[PDB]
Amino acid sequence: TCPFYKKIPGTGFTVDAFQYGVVEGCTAYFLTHFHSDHYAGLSKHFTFPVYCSEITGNLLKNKLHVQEQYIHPLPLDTECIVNGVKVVLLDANHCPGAVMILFYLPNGTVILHTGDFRADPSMERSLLADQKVHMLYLDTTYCSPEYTFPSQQEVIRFAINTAFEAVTLNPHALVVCGTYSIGKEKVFLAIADVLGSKVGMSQEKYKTLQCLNIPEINSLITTDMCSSLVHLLPMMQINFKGLQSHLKKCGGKYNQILAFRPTGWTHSNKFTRIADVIPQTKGNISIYGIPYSEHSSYLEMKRFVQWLKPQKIIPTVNVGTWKSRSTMEKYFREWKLEAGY
Ligand code: NI
């Protein structure tokens, strides 16, 4: 049955609550983004209204076959009215089409649901600047101080320089990038752009990326693996057996793979700067784990909350153990004491 932290009080709304059947007294189902832990349970047989971004709606229609009459896409940064409640969708800086949702309840309470997000100081200049928030439903994925990571831009610089150098030294090398859900597209697109190649992939992955409004996508992606020197594969195939196998299938077109696994965090970041990262190598296969995160680091999260100064924080991640919950509540107290609210 539905957890309390997926329910918006004083409304008939839920957020990312599609694996519970018919939720008692839910009139409208919001979806923050197209990742499987959040959409789990949608299908062509779903007949309640779903509210979401334009991109997420494209994906519901095309990938899950949800019927068009039940998809209610909203533009960003725009006051809209749902079942008599004013709502706004804000960019979450997560994956394509991911949003945070602002709710303005009839009694004057204001609620922000972050969905999944990576906090950034650019958010301190949206419709959030203009008013107070009583309740924050917060993405606490990395809510512990050991989670530090570089900026996405520093990680992309590292990957582009690495791939450029490798292929210049060996023009018969193949670059591989692992993927398991939408998100992290800049990794593979930036690499392809510096090598003057398209990114090759399965027809199903190509179809998924065409659902996204990426300007000049016919331009960056293809299903012709032959013409391409950057290939996308399932994250699971990013290991030595998977990559030897793939290398065989290219029919002596390539003699080496350099592969990137853009993971969230790895305990190497406690003892290593981005500049000092190295691969795992076996034969003519090298694998780099790079800390490209689409969630807030601990310090990014803390700054965002100390700026917003919500009256109450409800964590939405890591809530299933008493020790995790207590640890997060202790941080939230420090933040409030340090910030003076
Ligand atoms: Ni997500």
Side-chain angles (χ1 to χ4, degrees), residues 103-172:
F103 302 92
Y104 297 81
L105 263 51
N107 68 4
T109 308
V110 177
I111 296 168
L112 177 66
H113 202 299
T114 61
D116 280 345
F117 88 139
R118 180 162 193 186
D120 188 74
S122 66
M123 299 170 166
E124 304 168 15
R125 291 175 274 288
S126 60
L127 300 193
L128 286 179
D130 315 12
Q131 95 292 260
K132 162 177 194 65
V133 176
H134 299 94
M135 315 181 82
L136 178 62
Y137 293 64
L138 180 67
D139 171 19
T140 44
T141 297
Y142 303 123
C143 189
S144 195
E146 68 277 24
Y147 297 109
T148 55
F149 27 68
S151 74
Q152 290 172 168
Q153 192 272 335
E154 299 169 75
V155 172
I156 295 301
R157 173 94 295 193
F158 176 84
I160 282 159
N161 287 348
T162 304
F164 182 73
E165 169 189 312
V167 171
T168 296
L169 293 176
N170 179 190
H172 306 282

Side-chain angles (χ1 to χ4, degrees), residues 33-35 38 94-95 116-117 294-295:
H33 69 291
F34 196 76
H35 279 166
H38 302 247
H94 183 58
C95 63
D116 280 345
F117 88 139
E294 292 187 337
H295 298 270

